[PDB]
Amino acid sequence: LLKESFEGDGYHKGPKQVVALKATKLFTYDSIKSKKMFHATVATDTEFFRVMVFEENLEKKFIPGNTIALSDYFGMYGSLAIHEYSSVSEVLKICDLHLQTEERLVDGEFKVYRKSSGNNCICYGIWDDTGAMKVVVSGQLTSVNCEIGNTIRLVCFELTSNADEWFLRATRYSYMEVIM
Amino acid sequence: KESFEGDGYHKGPKQVVALKATKLFTYDSIKSKKMFHATVATDTEFFRVMVFEENLEKKFIPGNTIALSDYFGMYGSLAIHEYSSVSEVKSIEHLKICDLHLQTEERLVDGEFKVYRKSSGNNCICYGIWDDTGAMKVVVSGQLTSVNCEIGNTIRLVCFELTSNADEWFLRATRYSYMEVIM
Amino acid sequence: KESFEGDGYHKGPKQVVALKATKLFTYDSIKSKKMFHATVATDTEFFRVMVFEENLEKKFIPGNTIALSDYFGMYGSLAIHEYSSVSEVKIEHLKICDLHLQTEERLVDGEFKVYRKSSGNNCICYGIWDDTGAMKVVVSGQLTSVNCEIGNTIRLVCFELTSNADEWFLRATRYSYMEVIM
Amino acid sequence: KLLKESFEGDGYHKGPKQVVALKATKLFTYDSIKSKKMFHATVATDTEFFRVMVFEENLEKKFIPGNTIALSDYFGMYGSLAIHEYSSVSEVKSEHLKICDLHLQTEERLVDGEFKVYRKSSGNNCICYGIWDDTGAMKVVVSGQLTSVNCEIGNTIRLVCFELTSNADEWFLRATRYSYMEVIM
């Protein structure tokens, strides 16, 4: 029953120990320069944070369970940017998103009810027991195939300000994945 | 000519002539955090910087050639978080609209555009921006609504996101975005 | 058990059997114009008609085999206008996802639950919930007079599947018809 | 000019309703597959002008500008006149809307007019042009068989019988069945 949290943006020196609950298989966020990364959620026992790892050979330390200490990290857009090996030591339903007031970042697993082409996009619609919502996918995430009837896992998707309705677009460091 | 400094940490000095900076503004009233934007240039290419420390800002006066180190690259901009690099030494374009429609990748956007229409949205203000080469939507949510702005003015937009959407592509506003009426 | 009819004039008797018809309703309250919607068939396929003669709903009773004459085709439906155009004689509905799969704008009937309501520019936007997905309903004009709240099941007849850049929606045209169920 | 718009009421219309032929578009094919042909023409009384859809190919010879004609047996629908046959029409002895105005509407119309293109894009199952005007900017959606009309940024499309369309965010111009698109210059 942990609280959401925004790590203040800016540099963060000094040790801050967390518990690393979960993480995603290492993917490529930029296929052009062959740079890779992955995403993980850490937690103290009062609130939980979301982290963006940029060091390929650092996924070893984020095993589910491992209490670890984060230092020299970076905060921006409400997440933790772990960029290099050096600094890691060792020891939402749908209706809700429409009720929101501020662009956040969203994770979750939703059913897909529709798919279609977009201006330069792949527009999906995600079904839910509490309503439905637009998904825009541009850039590199279109490379992931996904069809109506599937269950999509979304991570680091940007809830977007807009006139009509708010929709989940895909930014630079977003990752998509089809679930059984 | 512009360039994306490779994302992640950037130690070591990179010396660049400070081109233009924006007034220091507050991006987060909740914790009362303040910042400003600025543009810097190498001889060939010019970059954009998001400066999160108020004091350092004075040092970003147009003309001062200064040296950057221990900085951070993310989302195609430089993050300066400290007294950090900015050290002294002894001391031209914008982008048209149509090009943004011809964009196939989502950018960050600065510029001067006339406003032609206004209307309220869901939790936001929609402006339309007139131009020699077309027209685009500008979606403003959050704090920047408190910028007064009317039909006929000329807003200056800094660190505005060009947004991936079906149909039209528009300029929304992120956390570090700043608006400024002109004339 | 699905059809369309060539536009233009259509003389001569065309014998059909009425399947279902709606109440007489007023489509233009200002000009106090009235009409009604009915579905007929030739028992290999069915047709959609729009009836502009008020005292003709007598005849379109579900069951009554009738023969149409001097009718008019337009916009993908049959237009019966005056009384002397109807003689007398002696099933496949669409689910939502289907409507997202279309390639070409239809007109649509059907009964769907409502999952959201909100007002848009000059209109009311309803969302309809379905086994096979969810879809938008824009209603502008006089049909806004129809009060509808979340959780109801509206009956929609002669609504238009409408082409849009992101997602297709059903909207109301001049002769559309709305109604709450139960 | 002076002549104002009006909408002929729906239903059958017997009896001669004499009107003067103002303008008219070429004969064009609204269904290329089923090879159905039509054309659009505007006609006016002393006071108002109406929009008529002619389905009889052998009539463009008769909606000549200036020629006063007599409409019997026609049909009203979607605020237009429906000349569907040759017998309907017989001979007798002889404005425009800026874009913003369309944002100002409250009741969905049909729209003719001429506008410059600033953007293009492919949509769900359509093309979305952006139309540019001295008085504003607005969205065109083109679906079905009209996508086969070739138009690109910079051009000026002539559009006739296009439907100004109700939507939540903003209202657009879409292309109904009997619409017609063309390029200029």
Side-chain angles (χ1 to χ4, degrees), chain A residues 2-5 8-120 122-152 154-179, chain B residues 3 5-39 41-82 84-166 169-183, chain C residues 5-44 46-182, chain D residues 2-6 9-168 170-185:
Chain A
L2 295 164
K3 322 209 176 203
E4 53 185 22
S5 54
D9 35 323
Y11 198 91
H12 289 292
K13 203 161 184 176
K16 183 258 185 130
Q17 179 174 356
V18 296
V19 202
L21 1 181
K22 276 87 213 93
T24 72
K25 83 156 155 163
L26 200 154
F27 67 92
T28 167
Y29 75 99
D30 195 340
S31 58
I32 284 88
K33 316 270 287 186
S34 294
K35 297 177 177 172
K36 296 187 185 277
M37 73 165 293
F38 72 96
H39 290 279
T41 290
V42 303
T44 77
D45 274 323
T46 58
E47 80 273 5
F48 73 99
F49 294 76
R50 292 221 317 264
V51 320
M52 297 196 305
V53 182
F54 287 171
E55 175 54 43
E56 315 181 10
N57 266 266
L58 237 191
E59 57 173 341
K60 319 165 184 303
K61 282 182 173 64
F62 281 102
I63 294 306
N66 284 6
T67 68
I68 66 179
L70 274 51
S71 45
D72 301 316
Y73 58 92
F74 202 83
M76 186 165 282
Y77 280 92
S79 277
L80 296 188
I82 290 153
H83 53 298
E84 60 190 3
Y85 205 169
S86 315
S87 50
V88 184
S89 307
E90 249 284 338
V91 181
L92 261 192
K93 307 246 186 180
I94 277 199
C95 60
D96 310 331
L97 277 92
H98 291 301
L99 305 173
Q100 278 252 353
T101 28
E102 217 201 301
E103 38 292 46
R104 259 165 51 79
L105 276 194
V106 204
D107 288 19
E109 309 185 338
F110 315 104
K111 304 214 56 181
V112 170
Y113 73 77
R114 77 171 287 262
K115 177 185 157 184
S116 77
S117 68
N119 170 299
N120 263 340
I122 301 295
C123 190
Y124 301 90
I126 46 182
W127 204 96
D128 186 343
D129 277 330
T130 187
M133 183 183 185
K134 187 183 179 184
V135 189
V136 183
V137 185
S138 169
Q140 309 215 0
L141 276 214
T142 59
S143 297
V144 182
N145 189 267
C146 171
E147 289 201 32
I148 299 183
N150 288 155
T151 305
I152 284 196
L154 303 148
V155 282
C156 210
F157 259 79
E158 200 177 64
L159 179 36
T160 298
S161 46
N162 180 50
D164 194 345
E165 253 167 20
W166 289 25
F167 57 80
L168 300 175
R169 67 165 302 189
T171 54
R172 276 208 64 179
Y173 315 97
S174 314
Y175 175 76
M176 212 178 310
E177 176 181 345
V178 268
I179 272 41
Chain B
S3 306
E5 268 287 58
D7 306 80
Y9 203 91
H10 287 283
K11 213 157 195 173
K14 175 198 184 62
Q15 183 178 351
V16 288
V17 181
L19 295 181
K20 199 67 177 184
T22 62
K23 87 161 188 180
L24 193 160
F25 70 95
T26 81
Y27 68 92
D28 184 40
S29 50
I30 300 165
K31 310 270 289 187
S32 288
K33 300 174 170 173
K34 303 185 193 172
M35 74 176 280
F36 69 96
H37 291 275
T39 298
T42 69
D43 23 343
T44 64
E45 47 205 22
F46 80 118
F47 299 66
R48 185 229 322 262
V49 307
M50 302 186 301
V51 193
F52 287 167
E53 175 44 281
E54 5 181 342
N55 248 333
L56 250 140
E57 97 89 318
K58 309 167 120 171
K59 292 189 178 73
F60 280 107
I61 292 308
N64 279 3
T65 78
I66 67 194
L68 274 67
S69 52
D70 307 305
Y71 63 95
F72 199 84
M74 180 167 280
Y75 281 94
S77 287
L78 301 187
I80 298 185
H81 45 184
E82 324 231 275
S84 203
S85 256
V86 183
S87 332
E88 233 119 323
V89 193
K90 58 175 189 65
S91 44
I92 175 71
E93 232 196 336
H94 294 278
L95 229 179
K96 286 171 183 174
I97 272 189
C98 71
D99 306 330
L100 278 70
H101 299 300
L102 307 178
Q103 282 280 335
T104 54
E105 190 178 324
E106 52 279 52
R107 293 174 31 94
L108 288 186
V109 176
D110 301 341
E112 307 170 338
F113 312 115
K114 293 194 73 283
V115 177
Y116 81 82
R117 88 187 298 276
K118 177 167 177 174
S119 43
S120 223
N122 187 280
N123 257 89
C124 57
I125 311 298
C126 290
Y127 305 85
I129 52 185
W130 206 80
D131 187 15
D132 291 324
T133 195
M136 203 181 327
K137 177 172 63 182
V138 187
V139 176
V140 185
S141 191
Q143 310 193 7
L144 279 298
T145 39
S146 314
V147 176
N148 206 310
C149 190
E150 303 179 28
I151 303 187
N153 298 151
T154 306
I155 37 176
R156 207 195 308 278
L157 306 167
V158 299
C159 202
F160 260 75
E161 220 171 46
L162 181 58
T163 308
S164 82
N165 171 9
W169 276 20
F170 61 95
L171 304 168
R172 72 177 304 238
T174 53
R175 277 199 69 179
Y176 322 135
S177 300
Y178 165 64
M179 203 178 314
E180 183 187 344
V181 190
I182 305 298
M183 318 268 87
Chain C
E5 239 294 357
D7 25 44
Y9 188 87
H10 292 277
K11 205 158 187 167
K14 181 199 178 69
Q15 181 146 346
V16 289
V17 181
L19 301 185
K20 217 63 180 173
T22 59
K23 83 154 183 173
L24 212 157
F25 78 95
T26 177
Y27 66 100
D28 193 337
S29 58
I30 283 82
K31 312 282 285 191
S32 311
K33 287 170 160 175
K34 288 168 193 178
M35 78 174 288
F36 73 84
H37 288 300
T39 291
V40 303
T42 76
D43 285 16
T44 63
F46 66 74
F47 292 79
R48 229 238 309 280
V49 316
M50 307 197 298
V51 183
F52 294 156
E53 173 57 49
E54 324 189 2
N55 269 308
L56 232 182
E57 58 178 332
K58 313 177 185 290
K59 299 181 168 55
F60 281 89
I61 295 311
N64 280 17
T65 72
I66 65 187
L68 284 31
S69 320
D70 308 313
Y71 56 108
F72 191 81
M74 192 157 269
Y75 276 103
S77 239
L78 297 177
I80 297 164
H81 37 29
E82 264 61 73
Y83 195 92
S84 73
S85 331
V86 179
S87 335
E88 171 116 10
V89 181
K90 67 113 137 329
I91 286 209
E92 177 165 7
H93 274 73
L94 268 179
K95 271 182 178 183
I96 284 201
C97 71
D98 307 349
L99 274 72
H100 289 130
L101 296 169
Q102 297 264 340
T103 331
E104 133 186 18
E105 50 278 63
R106 291 186 45 94
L107 303 175
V108 163
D109 301 26
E111 295 164 2
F112 324 91
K113 241 211 54 177
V114 175
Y115 82 84
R116 87 194 286 262
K117 177 179 162 192
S118 85
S119 54
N121 195 295
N122 278 342
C123 55
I124 324 296
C125 301
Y126 301 82
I128 48 181
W129 216 89
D130 195 341
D131 265 340
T132 201
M135 196 190 191
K136 174 181 164 191
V137 189
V138 155
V139 22
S140 94
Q142 315 201 6
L143 238 61
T144 53
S145 309
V146 176
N147 203 78
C148 170
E149 244 69 30
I150 301 179
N152 303 336
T153 299
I154 42 166
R155 198 207 308 279
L156 302 161
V157 340
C158 194
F159 261 62
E160 185 160 41
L161 178 53
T162 296
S163 59
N164 183 34
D166 55 89
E167 169 171 345
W168 283 22
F169 61 105
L170 293 183
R171 62 170 244 274
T173 48
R174 282 213 69 235
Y175 319 86
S176 301
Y177 171 71
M178 207 174 306
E179 180 183 8
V180 195
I181 303 302
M182 306 142 21
Chain D
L2 286 168
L3 303 172
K4 290 157 305 187
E5 265 167 5
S6 57
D10 359 337
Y12 195 95
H13 287 280
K14 183 45 196 163
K17 178 241 183 80
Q18 171 173 342
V19 291
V20 177
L22 297 186
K23 261 69 226 156
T25 72
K26 75 185 188 64
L27 213 168
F28 80 107
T29 156
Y30 70 95
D31 206 322
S32 58
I33 280 90
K34 313 250 304 178
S35 303
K36 284 157 164 169
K37 285 180 182 178
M38 78 179 301
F39 66 92
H40 286 288
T42 278
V43 299
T45 16
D46 306 64
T47 50
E48 37 198 16
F49 71 81
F50 295 71
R51 296 232 306 271
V52 8
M53 310 196 292
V54 184
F55 287 159
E56 181 50 71
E57 318 172 13
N58 275 321
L59 274 180
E60 58 175 340
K61 321 171 181 292
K62 295 190 173 54
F63 284 84
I64 297 302
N67 263 32
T68 70
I69 62 182
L71 281 30
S72 60
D73 304 286
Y74 57 98
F75 187 72
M77 193 149 273
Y78 290 96
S80 304
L81 307 173
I83 299 164
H84 45 301
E85 54 196 8
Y86 190 55
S87 75
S88 246
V89 180
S90 345
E91 216 115 359
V92 176
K93 64 102 199 65
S94 50
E95 266 188 313
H96 59 291
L97 268 180
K98 293 269 186 177
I99 284 206
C100 56
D101 303 325
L102 283 83
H103 289 290
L104 298 169
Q105 294 278 327
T106 46
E107 168 149 4
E108 40 183 354
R109 310 180 24 92
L110 306 185
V111 190
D112 309 4
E114 306 180 349
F115 324 95
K116 303 212 57 193
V117 173
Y118 68 81
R119 78 186 283 279
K120 181 175 165 201
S121 84
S122 77
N124 184 34
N125 268 310
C126 65
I127 324 285
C128 302
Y129 305 92
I131 38 172
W132 188 95
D133 193 350
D134 275 339
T135 185
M138 195 196 178
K139 168 178 168 194
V140 203
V141 160
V142 179
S143 162
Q145 312 193 354
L146 294 84
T147 48
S148 305
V149 179
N150 194 7
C151 155
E152 296 182 35
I153 295 165
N155 305 143
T156 298
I157 46 173
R158 202 204 319 281
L159 303 170
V160 325
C161 187
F162 258 68
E163 192 171 67
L164 156 63
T165 297
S166 54
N167 196 14
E170 168 192 331
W171 286 25
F172 50 100
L173 292 181
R174 79 181 291 250
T176 46
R177 286 194 67 120
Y178 309 93
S179 308
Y180 161 83
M181 190 174 322
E182 250 225 341
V183 202
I184 304 299
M185 183 187 187

